[PDB]
Amino acid sequence: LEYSELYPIQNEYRMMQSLDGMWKFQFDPEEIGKKSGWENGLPAPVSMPVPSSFADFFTDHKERDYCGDFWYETEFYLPAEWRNKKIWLRFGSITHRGTVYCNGMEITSHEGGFLPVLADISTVAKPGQVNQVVVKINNELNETSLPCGATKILNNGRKLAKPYFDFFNYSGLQRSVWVIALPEESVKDYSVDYELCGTDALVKYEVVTTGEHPVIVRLLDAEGELVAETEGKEGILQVANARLWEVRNAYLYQIVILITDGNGVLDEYREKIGIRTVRIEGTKILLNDRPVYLKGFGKHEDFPILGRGFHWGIVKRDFECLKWTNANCFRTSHYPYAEEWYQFADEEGFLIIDEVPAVGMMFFEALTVPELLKSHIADTEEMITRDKNHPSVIAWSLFNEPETITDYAYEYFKEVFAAAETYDFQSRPMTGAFEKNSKPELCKCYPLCDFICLNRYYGWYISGGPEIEEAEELFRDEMDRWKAKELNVPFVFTEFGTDTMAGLHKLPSIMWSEEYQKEYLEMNFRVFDSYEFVQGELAWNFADFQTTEGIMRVDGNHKGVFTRDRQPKAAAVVFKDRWE
Amino acid sequence: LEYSELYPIQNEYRMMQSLDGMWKFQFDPEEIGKKSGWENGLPAPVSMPVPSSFADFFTDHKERDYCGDFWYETEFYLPAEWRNKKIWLRFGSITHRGTVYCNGMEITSHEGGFLPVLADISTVAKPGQVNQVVVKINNELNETSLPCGATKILNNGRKLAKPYFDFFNYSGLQRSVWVIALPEESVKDYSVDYELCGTDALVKYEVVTTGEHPVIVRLLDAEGELVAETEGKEGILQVANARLWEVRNAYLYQIVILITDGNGVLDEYREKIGIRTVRIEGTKILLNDRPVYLKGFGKHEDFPILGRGFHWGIVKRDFECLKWTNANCFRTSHYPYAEEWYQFADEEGFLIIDEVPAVGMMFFEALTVPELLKSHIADTEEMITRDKNHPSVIAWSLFNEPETITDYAYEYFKEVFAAAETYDFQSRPMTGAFEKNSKPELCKCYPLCDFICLNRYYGWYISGGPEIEEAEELFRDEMDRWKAKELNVPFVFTEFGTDTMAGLHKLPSIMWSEEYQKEYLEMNFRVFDSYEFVQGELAWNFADFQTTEGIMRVDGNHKGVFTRDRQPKAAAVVFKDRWE
Ligand SMILES: CCC[C@@H]1NC[C@@H](O)[C@H](O)[C@H]1C(=O)O
Ligand SMILES: CCC[C@@H]1NC[C@@H](O)[C@H](O)[C@H]1C(=O)O
């Protein structure tokens, strides 16, 4: 990468200033912004909160459903002291794609709406002056970038997003934005990997800097005491009597990376890390050499009014709810989340399956597929480079429900997995979520996976309601087929659930009632527990969330175990009791 | 005041750094923190979002309902450049009362949970180092501070808040927190007052600084061009062809206040202001010499999960909803809001009745009343000093539903109104909201008001439901009595409404149904419109909001016209159509 993914910090060598707040904002339906000097300032803006999704603020359909080019602007005062440093704009994300301008100058463009965008403004920044940032953003969907979809043209050239995925096309500046200053020679990247040696541990590391000066790496314990120190861009930190990062029982060391010259320090980067190993052994998932059974949910970045907008309050409530259910894991369905989610998971000892936005791929024979592959690999590189050093991240999900039964699909995913392996210093488990169409006798892609993730809806989409006993039989039939393959790999259910309207009660139960959600889960558990190789269950979904409007979605997706405002339906207790 | 209420800005002279994010947090039920040295760091903290109210994150009752002492902590790097500046911690608020520590040292204490707390850390700050802030907060209610209530002690020592008011006792660090650096001689306060002279305007001003050097005041138009300049701490800016700030049609000038010495500028403060006049003439409220009829709502700072936590997203959605109803006004029931609300009202041309938290006073013969009065006047000073220069703020509300029929109450409020007048350079209208118990024949306090605000619930608390025809006659009976008093002042209804459960439909309507809310409002409008001296209507409430639990509150107060997640009930269209 031509930039650092490292989370910004502030110390003697590194500075940061938050650009969060009310920005200026303007829709650009005629695509005339770059033609009309908008990169020097928007002509008729309104105020827009950052971070947030823009959609749900407005009271008119055409604003909520806006698809196309739209613009953000703000101004910030840059302290004189920042002069001649490497000055960067850092966006938590820009959804889905955009071009960053600063002081009227095009700086960078980025494709992919769920990972950091870094824009080097060193040569155009004005220290000791007011500076301007303008962002051209586009939220259209296509088949050459993730997540995939189409764009429909209505009356008067009005664009409408048509997702190939089941979540609302929220967009904008949905995460925090910073302007930062780095030293001219800086720590750009680092990677850690762990080995357990009895009561001791080894922290293997690599550091990438933008210069040739000497590197020192220190490890501090949770009280800030030095426990290990080594010299060099590559080395091993030996940790006596290591306190391991454990499931729902985190312990975090602090790694400190220093660049020195002679007597003085040029740069210092610090980050909390956790000493832990994750391995697949036969059909078991091992955390620190002990089997762990995954218990939790697929989630979304989704909340009333804010859309996918980041807010620590959402993190806090969601983790308190997760803990109350006795969960230990969640999947970042269906895109990398704000970095802050992983920081918190690290502190709370939660396990994360980190997922790239490869959703809506079902297809692999189109002439656009080479471009799609490039995008998919790029997103994978960015995700892994960003998230690899979180102890919470124990697996990568490289797709959700693609077509997998053709040789077209196999050669495609072979390239993605190959690329992912080169990016992850830890080589931790890689997987993807399979839809039912990926039949055991047909699927060609499951051998690429370290463990297999299944999304199954026996009792909802297949033989629901009065046919639920047939659903169970069909479920066991498929699992018997997987069992007979004797693949000797763990299986994790990454989706199963029923749309459930809070307050809809019926005796006997019906599809959409709270009682049916309970009965469906009970049936699914009976099936899960019948197969030794099942090693995890992540329910779909943690909470009701927004989707595209349609005849199958009653104000979004109601397969939540919690309501959208984060309150438990009856089925939440079923999970709580089972996972205890 | 021993500090500045001015909103923080960043420029060559003034620096700011956000402390928002995840803080450390610890409950202190045994009241042991200070004797245990917690000001040096919390021993077993959890993470808590700032800004937010802490209550609704947790999944246990005793955490949600916690009443007593609790502590916050965070750390921040101070740039070395900030040395030789005056360095301050600035809390948007600390709810309800607290003591600020920095680097282990007690800095300041504050009583009053809805206005800024400033802590001068100049002498203890360590520029170029990590610094620590710890805050001890208490959220108990009593009768010597606002808002009033009691604190119940359960037999096991556990405390429970018992409000005398109808909103949940949210508390914590509910607004943004900054650390800021000011020049050693700085602009501390300023006041503007307007006079309209044909097509021109006069901006009279006073500036208070922390030194004796010359002051220059400039006024810039909305495009940044100079329209007026004067020298001196007191003066008049002459504005040719002034573009007045108008209801729902804002125009904002920028005032620029400079301190200078012989070698140049020492400090620069800039703020947007709007040229407008507010006057009461007979039964009319005049804005820029033209009558205005107030149309809008009482609001709350209240949102799912965040509690009263500030978020620009809530501001944006709420103002879009307000504009959609064709409103022009809201009251900050029942406490000053975060400053950002007023900034936005200034931009959107909304009128604000700014209200001090004098709620729950019904009582004035108790030995504790002199201390309550001092608290009330202190909050009034802070509110008016903070908010006086907003063009949106057209009136001060100095109470909500106190006892007003005794001589004790009259002497009390006489002092509050006198104090408020001394603090407001503009001498704008002052008022308070009266309950029904303040009968026209018995109330002694309405003559203190420049206009009268009535809270009335004819058709809800009085003769609701099958008796609504009687309610209308009773309402007209009271209004006929007010009419016969011929007070020649405007009346504004500041509360009227019905609890309404979204989705409860009945024909014929019943109390709590959406249809009844519509019929109740239609009845109230017929009465309002029967009296010339009625000059405004602010419905209770904009949105459903959280209250203490009880047999009368079904998950909070449902008199909202919008739901808590900001969607319109049937009655919302009734307002929209009337106010259009
Ligand atoms: C049978 C595929 C189910 C589908 N899987 C992907 C999720 O993103 C959707 O929300 C989920 C659903 O339809 O509920
Ligand atoms: C008869 C007084 C009514 C009362 N007034 C003050 C508000 O803070 C309450 O919410 C409102 C209510 O009970 O709805």
> What's B210-223 look like in SS3?
CCCCCEEEEEECCC
DSSP string, A376-439: HHHHHHHHHHHHTT-TTEEEEEEEES---SSHHHHHHHHHHHHHHHHH-TT---EEEEEPTTS-
In which region does residue A555 sit, left (phi positive, over 0), alpha (psi from -120 to 50) or beta (all else)? Answer: left
Q: Is the CB of A58 under 6 A from ligand 1?
A: no
B187-273: CATH class: mainly beta
d(CA B395, CA B398): 10
In chain B, residues preceding a discontinuity (C to N beyond 2.5 A) are 362
Task: Give the burial class of A30: count Cβ atoms within 10 A of its Cβ; 0-12 exposed, 13-18 middle, 19 or more buried.
Answer: exposed
Q: Which of B76, B304, B311 sits opposite A565 (nearest CB)?
A: B304
Q: Is the CB of A495 under 6 A from ligand 1?
A: yes
Q: Is the CB of A557 under 6 A from ligand 1?
A: yes
CA angle A50, A54, A55 (to 5 degrees): 160
Task: Give the burial class of A512: count Cβ atoms within 10 A of its Cβ; 0-12 exposed, 13-18 middle, 19 or more buried.
Answer: middle
Q: How many of the other CB atoms lie within 10 Å of CB of A162?
A: 14
Interface probe, candidates A22, A130, A302, chain B, greatest B C-beta count within 10 A: A22
d(CA A108, CA A2): 11
**CA-based R_g, chain B, Å:** 24
Q: Is B289 helix (H, G, I), strand (E, B) or coil?
A: coil
Q: Which of B59, B76, B565 sits opposite A305 (nearest CB)?
A: B565
Residue with tokens 């009263």: B308
Residue nearest to atom 8 of ligand 1 (CA): A166
Q: What is the CATH number of domain B278-577?
A: 3.20.20.80
d(CA A266, CA B368): 61
B447 Cβ contact partners less than 8 Å away, ≥ 6 residues apart: none
**CA-based R_g, chain A, Å:** 24
DSSP string, A44-60: S-EEEEESS-SGGG-SS
Is B22 in the A-facing interface, judged by CB distances under 8 Å?
Answer: yes
Sign of the CA dihedral with B343 first, then B346, B347, and B350 last:
positive
Q: Which two tokens stand for residue A243?
A: 């306190």
CB crowding B463-497: b at 16 or more within 10 Å, else e: bbeeebeebbebbbebbeebbeeebebbbbbbbbb
d(CA A42, CA A49): 16
CA angle A400, A468, A461 (to 5 degrees): 30
The closest alpha carbon to B543, from B527, B571, B565, belongs to: B565
Instruction: Tell me how far the alpha carbon of residue B386 is from its chain's centroid.
Output: 10
Could you give the strand order of the β-sheet that contains B117-120, starting from the edge strand earlier in sequence? B15-18, B177-182, B86-91, B117-120
Interface probe, candidates B12, B59, B64, chain A, greatest A C-beta count within 10 A: B59
Q: Between chains, do B58 and A320 touch, taking CB under 8 Å as contact?
A: yes
d(CA A452, CA A457): 16
**DSSP code of B80?**
G
Contact between A232 and A215 (Cβ < 8 Å) = yes
**DSSP code of A117?**
E
Atom index in ligand 1 nearest the CA of residue A495 equals 5
What is the architecture, at CATH level 2, of domain B15-182?
A: Sandwich (2.60)
B368 Cβ contact partners less than 8 Å away, ≥ 6 residues apart: B143, B144
Q: Between chains, do A305 and B12 touch, taking CB under 8 Å as contact?
A: no
Q: Which two tokens stand for residue A482?
A: 């997987």
Could you give the strand order of the β-sheet that contains B278-281, starting from the edge strand earlier in sequence? B278-281, B284-287, B290-291
Q: How many of the other CB atoms lie within 10 Å of CB of B370?
A: 11
Q: What experimental approach yielded this model?
A: X-ray
Is A157 in the B-facing interface, judged by CB distances under 8 Å?
Answer: no
Contact between A55 and A19 (Cβ < 8 Å) = no
Q: Which two tokens stand for residue B379?
A: 């909050």
Contact between B512 and B563 (Cβ < 8 Å) = no
CA angle B82, B87, B93 (to 5 degrees): 135
d(CA B98, CA B117): 9
Instruction: Tell me how far the alpha carbon of residue B369 is from its chain's centroid.
Output: 23
Q: Spell out which residues of chain B touch residue A313, defining contact as CB-CB under 8 Å.
A: 49, 52, 57, 305-306, 309
The closest alpha carbon to B352, from B371, B335, B369, B373, belongs to: B335
Tell whether residue B412 is among the known ligand binding residues: no
CA dihedral defined by B423, B429, B432, B436, rounded to 10 degrees?
160
Q: Between chains, do A59 and B324 touch, taking CB under 8 Å as contact?
A: yes
CA distance B311 to chain A (A): 8
CA distance A440 to chain B (A): 42
Contact between A200 and A241 (Cβ < 8 Å) = yes
d(CA B30, CA B487): 55
Contact between B543 and B564 (Cβ < 8 Å) = yes
Sign of the CA dihedral with B166 first, then B171, B176, and B182 last:
positive
Contact between B231 and B214 (Cβ < 8 Å) = yes
What are φ and ψ of residue B190, in 5° steps?
-150, 160
d(CA A168, CA A75): 30
Within 13 A of B579's CA, how many CA atoms are on the CB side?
Answer: 26
Catalytically active residues of B, by annotation = 401, 495
Atom index in ligand 2 nearest the CA of residue B495 equals 5
Q: Spell out which residues of chain A touch residue B15, defining contact as CB-CB under 8 Å.
A: 79
Q: Helix, strand, coil shares of chain B as percentages rounded to 5? A: 20, 35, 45
d(CA A122, CA A112): 24
DSSP string, A133-196: EEEEEE----SSSSSPEEEEE-GGG-EEEEESSSS----B--S-EEEEEE-SS-EEEEEEEEEE
Q: Which two tokens stand for residue B421?
A: 């007048």
Identity (one letter) of the amino acid at A515?
E
- B278-577 shares the fold of B15-182: no
Paired residues of A131 in beta bridges: A76
Q: Which two tokens stand for residue B211?
A: 């030194």
CA distance B309 to chain A (A): 9
**DSSP code of A81?**
G
Contact between A547 and A557 (Cβ < 8 Å) = yes
CB crowding A309-330: b at 16 or more within 10 Å, else e: bbbbbbbbbbbbbbebbebbbb
d(CA A68, CA B571): 35
What are φ and ψ of residue A127, in 5° steps?
-65, 140
d(CA A334, CA A113): 12
d(CA B344, CA B319): 9
CB crowding A269-281: b at 16 or more within 10 Å, else e: bebbbbbbbbebe
What are φ and ψ of residue B421, in 5° steps?
-60, -40
Residue B363, H or E segment: none
Q: Is A209 helix (H, G, I), strand (E, B) or coil?
A: strand
Residue with tokens 């005056």: B86
Contact between A100 and A107 (Cβ < 8 Å) = yes
Domain segments of chain B as ranges: 15-182, 187-273, 278-577
d(CA A498, CA A574): 14
Q: Which of B12, B316, B564 sits opposite A49 (nearest CB)?
A: B316
CA dihedral defined by B528, B534, B536, B541, rounded to 10 degrees?
-40
Catalytically active residues of A, by annotation = 401, 495
Contact between B351 and B328 (Cβ < 8 Å) = yes
- C-alpha distances (whole Å) from B74 to each of A352, A454, B47, B178 are 27, 42, 10, 12
What are φ and ψ of residue A121, in 5° steps?
-105, 20
Q: Which two tokens stand for residue A222?
A: 């949770």
Q: Between chains, do A304 and B10 touch, taking CB under 8 Å as contact?
A: no
Q: Which CATH number is A184-277's, of 3.40.50.300, 3.40.250.10, 2.60.40.10, 3.40.190.10?
A: 2.60.40.10
Fold of A278-580: TIM Barrel (3.20.20)
In chain A, residues preceding a discontinuity (C to N beyond 2.5 A) are 362
**DSSP code of A537?**
E
Tell whether residue A557 is among the known ligand binding residues: yes
CA distance A308 to chain B (A): 12
d(CA A361, CA A165): 9
What are φ and ψ of residue A422, in 5° steps?
-75, -25
Q: Which two tokens stand for residue A131?
A: 């500076």
Interface probe, candidates B63, B78, B305, chain A, greatest A C-beta count within 10 A: B305
Q: Which CATH number is A1-183's, of 2.60.120.10, 2.20.25.90, 2.60.120.260, 3.20.20.120?
A: 2.60.120.260
Terminal CA-CA length for chain A = 43
Q: Which two tokens stand for residue B266?
A: 């020492």
Q: Is the CB of A437 under 6 A from ligand 1?
A: no
Tell whether residue A178 is among the known ligand binding residues: no
Parallel/antiparallel/unpaired status of strands B329-331 and B351-355: parallel
Terminal CA-CA length for chain B = 43
Contact between A296 and A349 (Cβ < 8 Å) = no
What is Dmax (Cα atoms) for chain B? Answer: 78
What is Dmax (Cα atoms) for chain A? Answer: 78
Identity (one letter) of the amino acid at B525?
F
Tell whether residue A401 is among the known ligand binding residues: yes
Q: Which two tokens stand for residue B263?
A: 């070698």
The closest alpha carbon to B76, from B115, B50, B114, belongs to: B50
Q: Which two tokens stand for residue B179?
A: 């650390």
Q: Which two tokens stand for residue A139?
A: 């939220």
Residue nearest to atom 11 of ligand 1 (CA): A166
DSSP string, B11-55: SSS-EEEE--EEEEEEE-TT--TGGGTGGG--SS-EEEEESS-SG
Atom index in ligand 2 nearest the CA of residue B400 equals 6
d(CA A95, CA A98): 8
Residue nearest to atom 10 of ligand 1 (CA): A166
Paired residues of B355 in beta bridges: B397
Q: Which two tokens stand for residue A316?
A: 């806090």
- Summary count for chain A: helices (H), strands (E): 8, 30
